[PDB]
Amino acid sequence: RRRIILFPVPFQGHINPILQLANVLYSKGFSITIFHTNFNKPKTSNYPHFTFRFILDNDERISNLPTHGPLAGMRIPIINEHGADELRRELELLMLASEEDEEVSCLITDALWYFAQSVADSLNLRRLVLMTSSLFNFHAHVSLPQFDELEEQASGFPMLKVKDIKSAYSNWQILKEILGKMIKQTKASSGVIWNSFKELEESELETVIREIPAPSFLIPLPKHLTASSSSLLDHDRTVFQWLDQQPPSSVLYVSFGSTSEVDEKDFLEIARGLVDSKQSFLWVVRPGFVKGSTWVEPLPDGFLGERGRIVKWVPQQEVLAHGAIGAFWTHSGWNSTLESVCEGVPMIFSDFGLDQPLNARYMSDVLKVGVYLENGWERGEIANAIRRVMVDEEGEYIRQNARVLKQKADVSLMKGGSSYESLESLVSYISSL
Ligand SMILES: O=c1ccn([C@@H]2O[C@H](COP(=O)(O)OP(=O)(O)O)[C@@H](O)[C@H]2O)c(=O)[nH]1
């Protein structure tokens, strides 16, 4: 009796949170249509209860781009600057074809689809925005003019060091423009859904209240459901029979997300830090991860030994919840970070720029749930980080913080919790649009 249209950005880390939201909203009585590009499409047969519509790449034009590297997502700007007419065409089709007693309540877009705002306005259709990065991260964007007028303790941001900012915003006419339209149009939206929870980013709520005149809602989506049904790669599910053989809290999970890439100098250094830590590890290396190779070709044989295993892909949150996991070495993508937080797993942080440095520093020095490794890649430093989080008594407090943080995330979903009442408002709000 009330349908919601959800249009994600076709990259994991963007597909994952939006389909989590859609499932949650489905949990609350709404119908779901997903607008998706054919590129990077998820497995629609995992969502029998969703209707999928494929758009904007079907009859191609400027999107005959490469499918796998740092230059896909050039689709993002292209579609932003050229997709408006098709989007309006497709939305109008769907609103024609519903109704008997089925309105369309709103359109929820990834905040990167800033072109969607004027399209929805043109159809008198409320639009809601979904942020896939943190509130802290929005607090640094919407402060990127004090930074410009000007190495350690960033002025007006004691959380961060200058290294942090100068690595985060190091491509800054490259995405200056589209980062700002993004903000411009989520301010002008009818509401913003944030994938976190109030007690995770309490220090950041004031900014969001004062910068964004639309209502905000903080929902830790990974506490509602994992993102597994929206996996673009196939799960290596054999890891769990191997995890069932390990003692509790004695495996380090290692994974640098869906898009990062490292050059062989560094890939072989990470291996040795793993071996040098003498901890057991389950290492996800996406085929593509390494400069030179397809998968993990520069790796010698048995080099990991009896304690190491390597795979192309897992159901990450489910692994983070297995009792064998004692720590998570991550590139600090916001989804991974939130998943590890919601499962109570402490982290070792690396990063590849772009919100990742700020996620790492916030979890490292504010919440104190991990060790920020990046002054580079060095074996002994890597081994020291793994052991301080996993074994050292010095790091008992980080492990303890991780457990309490998860409890805070659990409590927030209970009646009178921040996340509970946030979701309750969101449903109420959408139902009156
Ligand atoms: O082997 C893997 C590696 C990662 N992921 C998921 O991929 C997403 C990556 O999102 P994130 O923001 O952390 O990283 P990004 O790829 O955007 O840098 C997370 O939900 C992970 O749980 C997964 O399911 N299996």
Task: Report how far residue 422's alpha carbon sits from residue 428's, in angstroms, rounded to the nearest whole number.
Answer: 10
- Give me the torsion for CA of 128, 227, 94, 129, rounded to 10°: 10
Overall resolution, Å:
2.6
**Ligand 1 within 6 A of 231 CB?**
yes
Residue spans of the domains in the chain: they are 1-150+173-236+413-433, 237-412
Q: How far is the CA of 341 from the centre of ligand 1 (A)?
A: 14
**Cβ atoms 334, 16 nearer than 8 A:** no
Residue with tokens 């994974």: 255
CATH number of 237-412: 3.40.50.2000
The alpha carbon of 117 is separated from its chain's Cα centroid by a whole number of angstroms, namely 22
C-alpha to C-alpha distance for 80 and 76, rounded to whole angstroms = 6
The answer to whether the CB of 33 is under 6 A from ligand 1 is: no
Residue 133 in contact with ligand 1 by CB distance below 6 A: no
**Which ligand 1 atom is the nearest neighbour of the CA of 16?**
20
- DSSP, collapsed to helix, strand or coil, labels residue 189 as coil
| Pair 62, 82: CB distance under 8 Å | yes
How remote is the CA of residue 89 from the centroid of ligand 1, in Å?
A: 33
Classify 138 as helix, strand or coil.
helix
Q: Which of 243, 336, 342 to mutate to test the pocket of ligand 1 (most atoms within 8 A of CB)?
A: 336
Ligand 1: centre distance to CA 97 (Å): 36
Distance CA 84, CA 367 (A): 41
Task: Answer whether 23's CB lies under 8 Å from 227's CB.
Answer: no
φ/ψ (deg, to 5) at 124? 55, 40
Is 258 a pocket residue for ligand 1 (Cβ < 6 Å)?
yes
Experimental method: X-ray
Pocket test for ligand 1, best of 12, 235, 240 (most atoms within 8 A of CB): 12
DSSP string covering 232-282: SS---TTHHHHHTTSPTT-EEEEE-TTT--B-HHHHHHHHHHHHHHT-EEE
DSSP string of 76-111?
HHHHHHH-HHHHHHHHHHHHHS--TT-EEEEEEEET
Substitution candidate for ligand 1 out of 226, 312, 316, 338 with most atoms within 8 A of CB:
316
**CA-CA-CA-CA torsion sign (225, 226, 232, 233):** negative
- How many residues would you count in the chain? 433
CB 419 within 8 A of CB 220: yes
Does any ligand 1 atom lie closer than 6 A to the CB of residue 356? Answer: no
